[PDB]
Coordinates of C-alpha atoms in Angstrom, one line a residue:
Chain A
X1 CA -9.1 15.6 -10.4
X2 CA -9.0 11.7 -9.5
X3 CA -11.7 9.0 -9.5
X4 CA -9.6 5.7 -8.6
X5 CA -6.5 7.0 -6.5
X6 CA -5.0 4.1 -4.6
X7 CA -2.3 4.5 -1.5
X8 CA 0.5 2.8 0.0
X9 CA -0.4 2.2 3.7
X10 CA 3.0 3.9 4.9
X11 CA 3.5 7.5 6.5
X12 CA 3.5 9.2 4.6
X13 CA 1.4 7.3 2.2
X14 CA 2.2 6.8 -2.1
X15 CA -0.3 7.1 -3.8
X16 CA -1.1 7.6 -7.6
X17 CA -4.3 8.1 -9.9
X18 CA -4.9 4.8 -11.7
X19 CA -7.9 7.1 -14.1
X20 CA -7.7 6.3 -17.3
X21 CA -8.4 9.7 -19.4
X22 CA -8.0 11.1 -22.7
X23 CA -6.5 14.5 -21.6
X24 CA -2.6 14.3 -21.1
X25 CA -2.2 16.5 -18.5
X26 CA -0.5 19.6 -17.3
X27 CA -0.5 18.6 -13.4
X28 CA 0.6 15.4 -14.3
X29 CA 4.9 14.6 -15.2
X30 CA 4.6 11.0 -16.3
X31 CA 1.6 10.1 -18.8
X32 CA 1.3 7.1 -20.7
X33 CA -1.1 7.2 -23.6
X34 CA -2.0 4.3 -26.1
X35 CA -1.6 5.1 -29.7
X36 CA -5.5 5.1 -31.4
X37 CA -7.9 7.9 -31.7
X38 CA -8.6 9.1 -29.3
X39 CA -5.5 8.3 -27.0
X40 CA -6.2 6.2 -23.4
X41 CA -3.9 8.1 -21.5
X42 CA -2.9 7.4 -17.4
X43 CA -0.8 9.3 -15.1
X44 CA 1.9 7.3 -13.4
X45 CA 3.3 10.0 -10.8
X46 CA 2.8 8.9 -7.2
X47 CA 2.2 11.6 -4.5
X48 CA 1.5 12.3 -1.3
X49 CA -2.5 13.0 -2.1
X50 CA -4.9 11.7 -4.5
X51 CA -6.5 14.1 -5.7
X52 CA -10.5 14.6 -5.0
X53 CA -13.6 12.8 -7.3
Chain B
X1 CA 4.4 7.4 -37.9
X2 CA 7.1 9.9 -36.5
X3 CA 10.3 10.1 -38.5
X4 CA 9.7 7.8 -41.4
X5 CA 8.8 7.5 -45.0
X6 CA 5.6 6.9 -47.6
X7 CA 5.6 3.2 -48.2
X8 CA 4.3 3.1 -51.4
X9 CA 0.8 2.5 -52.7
X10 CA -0.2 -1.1 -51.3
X11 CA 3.9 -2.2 -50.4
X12 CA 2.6 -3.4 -47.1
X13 CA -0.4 -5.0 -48.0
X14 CA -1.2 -6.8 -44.9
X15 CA -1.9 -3.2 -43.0
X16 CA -5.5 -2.3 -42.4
X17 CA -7.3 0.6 -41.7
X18 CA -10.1 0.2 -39.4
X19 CA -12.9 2.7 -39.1
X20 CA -15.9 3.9 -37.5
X21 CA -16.7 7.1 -39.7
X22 CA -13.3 8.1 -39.6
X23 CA -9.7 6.2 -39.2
X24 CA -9.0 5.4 -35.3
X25 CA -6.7 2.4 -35.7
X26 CA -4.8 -0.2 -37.4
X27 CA -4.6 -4.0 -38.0
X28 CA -2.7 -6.7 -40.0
X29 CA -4.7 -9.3 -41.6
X30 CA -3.8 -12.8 -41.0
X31 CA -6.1 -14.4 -43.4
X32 CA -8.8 -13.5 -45.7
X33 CA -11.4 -13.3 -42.9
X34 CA -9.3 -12.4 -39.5
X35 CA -7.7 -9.1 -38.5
X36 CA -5.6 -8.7 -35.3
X37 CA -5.7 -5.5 -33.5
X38 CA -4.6 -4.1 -30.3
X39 CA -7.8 -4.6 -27.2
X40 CA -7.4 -0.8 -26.9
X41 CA -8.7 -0.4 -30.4
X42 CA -11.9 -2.3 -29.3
X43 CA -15.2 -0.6 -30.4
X44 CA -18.5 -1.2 -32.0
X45 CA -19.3 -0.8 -35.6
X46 CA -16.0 -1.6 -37.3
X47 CA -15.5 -1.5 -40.8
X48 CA -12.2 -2.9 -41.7
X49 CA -10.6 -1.2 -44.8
X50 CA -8.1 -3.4 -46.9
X51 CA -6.1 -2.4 -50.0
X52 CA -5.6 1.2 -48.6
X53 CA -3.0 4.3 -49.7
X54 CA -4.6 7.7 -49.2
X55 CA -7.1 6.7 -47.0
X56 CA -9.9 9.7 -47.3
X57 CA -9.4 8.8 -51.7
X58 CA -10.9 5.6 -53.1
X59 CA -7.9 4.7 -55.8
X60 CA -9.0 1.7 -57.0
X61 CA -7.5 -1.3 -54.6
X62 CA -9.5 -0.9 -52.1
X63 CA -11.7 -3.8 -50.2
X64 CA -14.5 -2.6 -47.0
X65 CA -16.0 -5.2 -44.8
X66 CA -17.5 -5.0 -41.8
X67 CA -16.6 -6.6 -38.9
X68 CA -19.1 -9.4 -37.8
X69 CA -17.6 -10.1 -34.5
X70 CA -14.4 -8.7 -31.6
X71 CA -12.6 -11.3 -29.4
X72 CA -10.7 -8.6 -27.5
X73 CA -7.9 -11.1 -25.2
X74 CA -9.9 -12.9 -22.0
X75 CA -7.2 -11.4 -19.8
X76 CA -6.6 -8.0 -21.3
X77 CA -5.4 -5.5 -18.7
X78 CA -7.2 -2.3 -19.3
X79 CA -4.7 -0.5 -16.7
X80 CA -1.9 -1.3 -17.4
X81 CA -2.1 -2.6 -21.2
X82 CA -0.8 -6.0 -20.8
X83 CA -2.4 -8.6 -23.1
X84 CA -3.2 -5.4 -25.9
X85 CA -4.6 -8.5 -28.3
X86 CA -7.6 -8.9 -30.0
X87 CA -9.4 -10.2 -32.9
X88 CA -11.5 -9.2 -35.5
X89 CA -13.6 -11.4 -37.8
X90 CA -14.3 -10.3 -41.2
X91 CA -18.3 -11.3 -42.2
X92 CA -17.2 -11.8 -45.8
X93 CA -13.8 -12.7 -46.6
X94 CA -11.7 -11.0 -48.7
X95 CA -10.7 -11.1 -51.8
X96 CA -6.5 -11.7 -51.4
X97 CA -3.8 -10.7 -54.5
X98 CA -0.7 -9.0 -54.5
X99 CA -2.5 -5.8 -53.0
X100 CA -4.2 -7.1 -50.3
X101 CA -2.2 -10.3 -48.9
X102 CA -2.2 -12.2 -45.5
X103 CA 1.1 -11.9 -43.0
X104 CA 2.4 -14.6 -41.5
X105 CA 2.4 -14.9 -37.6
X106 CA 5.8 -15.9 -36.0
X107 CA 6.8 -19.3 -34.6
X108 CA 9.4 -17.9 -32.6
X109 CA 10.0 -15.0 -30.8
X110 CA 11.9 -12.2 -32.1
X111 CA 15.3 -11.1 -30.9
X112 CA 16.8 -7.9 -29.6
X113 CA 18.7 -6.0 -32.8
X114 CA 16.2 -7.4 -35.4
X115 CA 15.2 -4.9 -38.1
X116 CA 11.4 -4.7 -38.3
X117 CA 9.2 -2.8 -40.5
X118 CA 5.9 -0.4 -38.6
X119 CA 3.2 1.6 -40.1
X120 CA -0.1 3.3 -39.9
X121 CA -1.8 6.5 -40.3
X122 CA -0.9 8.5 -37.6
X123 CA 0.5 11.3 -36.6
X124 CA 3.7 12.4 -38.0
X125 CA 5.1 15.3 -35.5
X126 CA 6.2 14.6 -32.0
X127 CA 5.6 17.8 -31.2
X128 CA 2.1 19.2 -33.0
X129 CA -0.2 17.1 -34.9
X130 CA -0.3 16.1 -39.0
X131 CA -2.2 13.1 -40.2
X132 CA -0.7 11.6 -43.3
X133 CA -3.1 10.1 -45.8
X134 CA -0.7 7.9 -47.6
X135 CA 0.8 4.9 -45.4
X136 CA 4.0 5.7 -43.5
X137 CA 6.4 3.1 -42.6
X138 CA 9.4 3.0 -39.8
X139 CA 12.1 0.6 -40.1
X140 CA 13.0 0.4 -36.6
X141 CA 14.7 -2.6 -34.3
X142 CA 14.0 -4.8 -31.7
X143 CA 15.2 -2.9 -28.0
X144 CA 16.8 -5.4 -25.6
X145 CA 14.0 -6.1 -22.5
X146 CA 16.4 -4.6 -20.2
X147 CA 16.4 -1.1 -22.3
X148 CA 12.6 -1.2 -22.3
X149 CA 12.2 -1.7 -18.5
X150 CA 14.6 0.8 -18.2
X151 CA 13.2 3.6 -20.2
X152 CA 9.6 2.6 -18.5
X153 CA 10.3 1.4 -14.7
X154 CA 7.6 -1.0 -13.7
X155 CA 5.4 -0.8 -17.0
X156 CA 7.0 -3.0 -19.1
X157 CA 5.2 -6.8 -18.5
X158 CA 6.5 -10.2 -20.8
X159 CA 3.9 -9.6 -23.3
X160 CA 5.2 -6.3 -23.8
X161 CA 9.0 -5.0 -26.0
X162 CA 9.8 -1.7 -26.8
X163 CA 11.5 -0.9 -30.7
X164 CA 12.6 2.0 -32.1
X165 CA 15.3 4.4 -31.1
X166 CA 16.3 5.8 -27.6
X167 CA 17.4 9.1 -29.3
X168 CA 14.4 10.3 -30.5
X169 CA 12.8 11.1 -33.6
X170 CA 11.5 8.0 -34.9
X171 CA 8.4 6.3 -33.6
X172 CA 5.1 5.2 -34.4
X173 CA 2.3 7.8 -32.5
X174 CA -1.2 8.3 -32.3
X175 CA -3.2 6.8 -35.2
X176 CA -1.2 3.6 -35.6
X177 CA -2.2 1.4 -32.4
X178 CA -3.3 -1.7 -33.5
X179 CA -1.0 -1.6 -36.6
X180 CA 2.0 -4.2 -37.4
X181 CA 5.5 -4.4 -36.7
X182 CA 6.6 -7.0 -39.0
X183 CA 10.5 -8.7 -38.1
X184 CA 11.6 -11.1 -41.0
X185 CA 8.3 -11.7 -42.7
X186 CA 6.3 -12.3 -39.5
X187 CA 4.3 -10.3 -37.5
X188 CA 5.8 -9.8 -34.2
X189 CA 4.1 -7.0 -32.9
X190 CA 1.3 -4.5 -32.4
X191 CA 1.5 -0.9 -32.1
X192 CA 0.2 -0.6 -28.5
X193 CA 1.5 2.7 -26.3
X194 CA 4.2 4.9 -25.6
X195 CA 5.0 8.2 -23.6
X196 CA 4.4 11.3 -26.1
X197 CA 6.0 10.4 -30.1
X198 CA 9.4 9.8 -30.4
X199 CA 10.7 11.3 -27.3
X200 CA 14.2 10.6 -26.5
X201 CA 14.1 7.8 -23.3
X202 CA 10.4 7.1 -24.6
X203 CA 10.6 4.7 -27.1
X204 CA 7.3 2.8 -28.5
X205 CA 5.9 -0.6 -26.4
X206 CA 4.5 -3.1 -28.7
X207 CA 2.3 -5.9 -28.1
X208 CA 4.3 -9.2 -28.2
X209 CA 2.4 -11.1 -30.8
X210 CA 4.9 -14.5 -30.4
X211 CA 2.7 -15.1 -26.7
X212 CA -0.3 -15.0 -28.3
X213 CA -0.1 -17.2 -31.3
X214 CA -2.4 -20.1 -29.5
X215 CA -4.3 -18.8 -28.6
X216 CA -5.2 -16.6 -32.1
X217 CA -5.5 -20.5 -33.9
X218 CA -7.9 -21.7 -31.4
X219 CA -10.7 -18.8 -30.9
X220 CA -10.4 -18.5 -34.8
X221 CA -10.7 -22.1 -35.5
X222 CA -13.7 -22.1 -33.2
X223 CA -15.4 -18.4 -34.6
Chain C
X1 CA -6.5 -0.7 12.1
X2 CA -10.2 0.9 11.5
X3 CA -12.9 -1.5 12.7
X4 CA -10.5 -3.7 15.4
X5 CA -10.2 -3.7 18.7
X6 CA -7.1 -2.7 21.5
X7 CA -5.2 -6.5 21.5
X8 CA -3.7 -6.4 24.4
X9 CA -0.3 -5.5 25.6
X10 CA 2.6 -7.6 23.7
X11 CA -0.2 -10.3 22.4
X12 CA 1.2 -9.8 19.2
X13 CA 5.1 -10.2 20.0
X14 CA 6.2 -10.8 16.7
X15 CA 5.0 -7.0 15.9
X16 CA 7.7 -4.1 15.3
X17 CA 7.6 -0.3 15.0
X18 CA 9.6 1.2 12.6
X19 CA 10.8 4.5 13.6
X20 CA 12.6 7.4 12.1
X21 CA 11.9 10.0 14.8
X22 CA 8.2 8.7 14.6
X23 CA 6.2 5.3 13.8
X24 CA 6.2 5.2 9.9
X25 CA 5.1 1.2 9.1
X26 CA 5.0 -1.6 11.1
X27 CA 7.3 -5.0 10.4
X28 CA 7.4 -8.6 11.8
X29 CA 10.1 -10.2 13.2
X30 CA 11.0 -13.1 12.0
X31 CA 14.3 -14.4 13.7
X32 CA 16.4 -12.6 16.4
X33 CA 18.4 -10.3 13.7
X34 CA 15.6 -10.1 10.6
X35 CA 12.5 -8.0 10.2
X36 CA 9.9 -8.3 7.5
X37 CA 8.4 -5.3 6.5
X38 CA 6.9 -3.5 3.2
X39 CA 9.2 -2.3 0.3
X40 CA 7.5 0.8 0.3
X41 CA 8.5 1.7 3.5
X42 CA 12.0 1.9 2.4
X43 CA 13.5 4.7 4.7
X44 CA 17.2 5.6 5.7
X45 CA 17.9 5.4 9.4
X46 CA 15.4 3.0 10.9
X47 CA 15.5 1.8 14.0
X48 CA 13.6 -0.9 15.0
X49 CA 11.1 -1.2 18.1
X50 CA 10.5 -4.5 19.5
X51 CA 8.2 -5.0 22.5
X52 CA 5.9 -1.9 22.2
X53 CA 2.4 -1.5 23.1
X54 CA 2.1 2.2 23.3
X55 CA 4.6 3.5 21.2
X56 CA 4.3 6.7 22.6
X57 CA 5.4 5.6 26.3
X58 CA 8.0 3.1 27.7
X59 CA 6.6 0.8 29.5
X60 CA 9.7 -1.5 30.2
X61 CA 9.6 -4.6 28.0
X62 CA 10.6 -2.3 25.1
X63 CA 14.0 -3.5 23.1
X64 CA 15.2 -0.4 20.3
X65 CA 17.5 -1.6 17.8
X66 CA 18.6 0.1 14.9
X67 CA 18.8 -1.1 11.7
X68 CA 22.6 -2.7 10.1
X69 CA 21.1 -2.8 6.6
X70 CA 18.3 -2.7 4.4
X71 CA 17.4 -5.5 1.5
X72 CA 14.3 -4.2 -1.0
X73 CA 13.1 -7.0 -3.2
X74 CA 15.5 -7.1 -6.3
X75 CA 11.9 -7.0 -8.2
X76 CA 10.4 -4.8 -6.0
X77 CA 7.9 -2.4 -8.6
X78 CA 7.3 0.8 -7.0
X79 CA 4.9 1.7 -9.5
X80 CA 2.6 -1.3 -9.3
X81 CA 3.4 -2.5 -5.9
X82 CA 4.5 -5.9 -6.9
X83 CA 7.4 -7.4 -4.6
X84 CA 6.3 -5.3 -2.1
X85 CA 8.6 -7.2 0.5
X86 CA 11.9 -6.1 2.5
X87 CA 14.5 -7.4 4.8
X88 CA 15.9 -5.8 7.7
X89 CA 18.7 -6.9 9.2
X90 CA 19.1 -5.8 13.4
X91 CA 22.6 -4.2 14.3
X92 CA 22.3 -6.7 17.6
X93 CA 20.0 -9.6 18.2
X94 CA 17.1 -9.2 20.0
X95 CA 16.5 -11.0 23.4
X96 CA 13.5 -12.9 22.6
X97 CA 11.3 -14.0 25.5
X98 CA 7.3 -14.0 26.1
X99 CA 6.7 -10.2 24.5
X100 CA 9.6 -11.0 21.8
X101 CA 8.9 -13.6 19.6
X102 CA 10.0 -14.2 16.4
X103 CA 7.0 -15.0 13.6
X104 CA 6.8 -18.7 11.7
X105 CA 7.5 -18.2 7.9
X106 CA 4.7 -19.6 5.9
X107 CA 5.5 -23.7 4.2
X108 CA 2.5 -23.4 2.1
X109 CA 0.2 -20.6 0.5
X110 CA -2.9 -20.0 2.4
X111 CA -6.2 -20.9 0.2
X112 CA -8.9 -18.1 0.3
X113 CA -11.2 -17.9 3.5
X114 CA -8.7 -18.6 6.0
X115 CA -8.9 -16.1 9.4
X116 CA -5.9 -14.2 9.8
X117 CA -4.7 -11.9 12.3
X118 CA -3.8 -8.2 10.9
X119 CA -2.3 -5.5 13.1
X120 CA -0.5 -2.1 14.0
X121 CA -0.8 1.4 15.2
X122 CA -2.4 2.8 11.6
X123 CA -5.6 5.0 11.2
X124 CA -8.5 4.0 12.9
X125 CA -11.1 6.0 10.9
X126 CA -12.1 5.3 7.5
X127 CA -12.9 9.1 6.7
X128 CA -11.0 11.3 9.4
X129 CA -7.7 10.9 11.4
X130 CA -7.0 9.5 14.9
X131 CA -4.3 7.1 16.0
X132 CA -4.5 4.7 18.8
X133 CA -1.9 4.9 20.0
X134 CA -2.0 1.6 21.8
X135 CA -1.8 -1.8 19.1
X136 CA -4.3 -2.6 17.6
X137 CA -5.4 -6.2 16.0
X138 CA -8.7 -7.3 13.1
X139 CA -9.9 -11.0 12.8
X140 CA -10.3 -10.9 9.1
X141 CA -10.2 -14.1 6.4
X142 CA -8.4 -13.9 3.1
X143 CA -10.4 -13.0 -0.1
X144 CA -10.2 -15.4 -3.3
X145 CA -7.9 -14.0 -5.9
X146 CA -10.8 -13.6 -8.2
X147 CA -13.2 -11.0 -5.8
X148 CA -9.7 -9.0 -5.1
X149 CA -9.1 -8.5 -9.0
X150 CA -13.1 -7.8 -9.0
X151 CA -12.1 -5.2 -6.6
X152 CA -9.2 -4.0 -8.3
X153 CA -9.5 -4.4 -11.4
X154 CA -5.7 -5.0 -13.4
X155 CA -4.2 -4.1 -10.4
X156 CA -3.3 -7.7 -8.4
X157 CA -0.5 -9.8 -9.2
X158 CA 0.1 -12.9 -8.2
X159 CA 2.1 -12.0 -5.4
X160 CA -0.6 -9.8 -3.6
X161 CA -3.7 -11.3 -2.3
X162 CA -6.9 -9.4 -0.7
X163 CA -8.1 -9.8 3.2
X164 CA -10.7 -8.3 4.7
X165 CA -14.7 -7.4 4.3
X166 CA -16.4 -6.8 0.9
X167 CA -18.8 -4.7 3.1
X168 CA -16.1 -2.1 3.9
X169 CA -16.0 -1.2 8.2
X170 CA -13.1 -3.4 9.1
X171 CA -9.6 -2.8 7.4
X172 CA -5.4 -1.7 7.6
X173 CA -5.0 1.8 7.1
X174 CA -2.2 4.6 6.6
X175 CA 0.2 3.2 9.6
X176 CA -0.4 -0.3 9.0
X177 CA 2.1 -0.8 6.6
X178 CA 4.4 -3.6 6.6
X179 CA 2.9 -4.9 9.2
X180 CA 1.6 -9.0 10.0
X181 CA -0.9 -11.0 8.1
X182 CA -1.1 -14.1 10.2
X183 CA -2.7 -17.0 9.2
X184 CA -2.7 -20.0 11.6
X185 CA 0.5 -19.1 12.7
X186 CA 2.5 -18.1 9.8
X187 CA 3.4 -15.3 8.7
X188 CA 1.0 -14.9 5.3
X189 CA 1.4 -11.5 4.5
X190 CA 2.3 -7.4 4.7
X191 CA 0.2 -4.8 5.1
X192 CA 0.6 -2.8 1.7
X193 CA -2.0 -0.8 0.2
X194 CA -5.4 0.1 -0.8
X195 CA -8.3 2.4 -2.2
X196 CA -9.4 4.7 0.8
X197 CA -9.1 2.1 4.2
X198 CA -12.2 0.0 5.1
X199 CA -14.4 1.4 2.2
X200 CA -17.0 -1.0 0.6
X201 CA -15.7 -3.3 -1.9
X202 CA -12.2 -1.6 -1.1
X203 CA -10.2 -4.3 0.8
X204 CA -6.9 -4.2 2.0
X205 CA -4.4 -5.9 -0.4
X206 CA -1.4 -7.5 1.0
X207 CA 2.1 -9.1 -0.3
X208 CA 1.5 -13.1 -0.7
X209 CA 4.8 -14.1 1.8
X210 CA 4.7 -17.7 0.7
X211 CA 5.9 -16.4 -2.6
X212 CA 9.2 -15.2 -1.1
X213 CA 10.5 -18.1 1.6
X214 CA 13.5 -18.8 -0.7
X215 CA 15.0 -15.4 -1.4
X216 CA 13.7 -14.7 2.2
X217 CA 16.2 -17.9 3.5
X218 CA 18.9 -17.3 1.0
X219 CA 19.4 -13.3 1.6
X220 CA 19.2 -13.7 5.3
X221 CA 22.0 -16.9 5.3
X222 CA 24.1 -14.6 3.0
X223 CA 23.5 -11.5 5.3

C-alpha cells in the first residue's frame, strides 16, 4: 500500500512512499518513526513502483 | 528511555508528562505557565502533568493543568520533521519549588562532545516493549553534524542533531518525544525521532532548541 | 511530455539524449564540452546525443559523444531530491551550428508566472504508456513557490520550484528527466520529478538552476 508515492522523472523512475503511518512495516527496509504514542512512522526506501492507493 | 537509569523522584523537575487519558509525550517547562514540546506531539485536550515520578500513582508532588492553548511552529514540516517545535500554554500557572522548577533555554548552541542529560517515560527495550513508571534518564552527548548526516543520509536538516551512542544500546524511544535533552543547564533539545531504539548506526535526532529561541520569547510574550 | 505538441526537428538545439543502450533522461547543453542534466539520472557509461529528433532513426545532423566524466552535486540528496543538478563533461567538443546550440545560463532567478519552454522524448500519457518518439515541447509558466509547497506539502526546497497547470493535462513525465526548463532564454531549470505526470494539482517540480551558476562556472573552469 501507498497513498502519496512521488517519482523521479528518469528511466527507470525512483520513487518512494512519502505516507506517513503508524505501522513500521515488514515490506519496508528503512522506517523512520517519531518517538510519542502512537509513533508517526514513514518509509524512506525508493523503488522502482509506488505501490497502489 | 533505552539503556539508562531511574532519575530519582522529582531530580529533573523541569520534565513533564503530557496526557490525554493516558501518557503520549513529554515536555520541559520554561516557566510557570509555558511548556515546549515537539509539533508531533500536537493534539487536543492536553493536560500537562508537573511534579511527576510514577506516573499512573499520585505521590504527593504532583501539579495537573490543562492546556489552554498549542502554537505548534508556523513552518513545521510534517514530512520530514524539520521545525519539531511547539508550545503549550498552561491556563493557570504553576505553582514552582524545588520539585517543579523552570529550565533555562540556551543562548548559544551546543557543541559536539557535550554531555547532556534525556528523559521520559518510554519505552525501555529496543527490542520488545516495557513502559517504566518512574522517570528514566540518559546521559548521552552531543554527535558531530557530520556523524548524524551520516547515520541518516538526507534526513538530517540544521534544526535537527543527533546524541547518543553509535553502538547501540542507549537511546531515548517511544514515549519520550517532546521530552528534554538538557546540555550544561539549558535545554538544548527535544526528543523528536529516530530509526527503531537504540540501534547501532541509528542514534536519536533531537530538535535543535538553540534555532528556536526567538521565536519561543515572541509568541509567548504575545499569548 | 503529456499534453505538448511535436516541436519540430532541432527547434530545441540545446536538447540532449542521454543514452546507455537506450534514452534514459534528457540534458542541456550548455557549452561545446558540458551538459546539464538531473542528479538522479546518475548512470555509468553515457554517451551523449546531440542533434536528435527521432532518437530512434539517424537522420544526419546527429553528433554522439560519450561522456569523459560525471560531476553530481556535492549536496545532491537522493532522498529528498534537493541538488538535483549534474555536470557532464564531453570526451570531444561538439560542432555547434544551427541544430547544436549551446543553452544561456540563467543571471537572475525567474519570478513566478513566467512562460517557459519544457521538453524531451518522456511519456505522453498521464495514465498509460506510449513514447513519441519524435521531441516533444509544453508552453507552461512557472508556479509561485507557495501553490508548489500547497501541492507538495514539506517536500520543496528552495532549490526546486513548480511549472506547469494546477488543472493537471499538460506536464514532464517518466523520460523527461534532466531535461530544459527555458525561460526567456535561459536555462531556468531540470526536469526532476513529480506525483503521477499531468495529474490535477500534481505539477511537475524542477531544480531552480539560478541557484547553481557559481559551482556550475567554477567546476566546469576546473574540469
Amino acid at each position: 500500500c501507498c497513498d502519496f508515492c512521488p517519482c523521479t522523472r528518469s528511466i527507470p523512475p525512483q520513487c518512494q512512499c512519502t505516507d506517513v503511518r503508524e505501522k513500521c512495516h515488514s515490506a519496508c527496509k528503512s522506517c523512520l518513526c517519531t518517538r510519542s504514542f502512537p509513533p508517526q512512522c514513514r518509509c524512506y526506501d525508493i523503488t522502482d513502483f509506488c505501490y497502489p492507493s | 528511555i533505552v539503556g539508562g537509569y531511574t532519575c530519582g523522584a522529582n531530580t529533573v523537575p523541569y520534565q513533564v508528562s503530557l496526557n490525554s487519558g493516558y501518557h503520549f509525550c513529554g515536555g520541559s517547562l520554561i516557566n510557570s505557565q509555558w511548556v515546549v514540546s515537539a509539533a508531533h506531539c500536537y493534539k487536543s485536550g492536553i493536560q500537562v502533568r508537573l511534579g511527576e515520578d510514577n506516573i499512573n500513582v499520585v505521590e504527593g508532588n504532583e501539579q495537573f493543568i490543562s492546556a489552554s492553548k498549542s502554537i505548534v511552529h508556523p513552518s513545521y514540516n510534517s514530512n520530514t520533521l524539520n521545525n519539531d517545535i511547539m508550545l503549550i500554554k498552561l491556563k493557570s500557572a504553576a505553582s514552582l519549588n524545588s520539585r517543579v522548577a523552570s529550565i533555562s533555554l540556551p543562548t548559544s548552541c551546543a557543541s559536539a562532545g557535550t554531555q547532556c542529560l534525556i528523559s521520559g517515560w518510554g519505552n525501555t527495550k529496543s527490542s520488545g516493549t516495557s513502559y517504566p513508571d518512574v522517570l528514566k534518564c540518559l546521559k548521552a552527548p552531543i554527535l558531530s553534524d557530520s556523524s548524524c548526516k551520516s547515520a541518516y543520509p538526507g534526513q538530517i536538516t540544521s534544526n535537527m542533531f543527533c546524541a547518543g551512542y553509535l553502538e547501540g544500546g542507549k537511546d531515548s524511544c517511544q514515549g519520550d518525544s517532546g521530552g528534554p535533552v538538557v546540555c550544561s543547564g539549558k535545554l538544548q533539545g527535544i526528543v523528536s525521532w529516530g530509526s527503531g531504539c537504540a540501534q547501532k548506526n541509528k542514534p536519536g535526532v533531537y530538535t535543535k532548541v538553540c534555532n528556536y529561541v526567538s521565536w519561543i520569547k515572541q509568541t509567548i510574550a504575545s499569548n
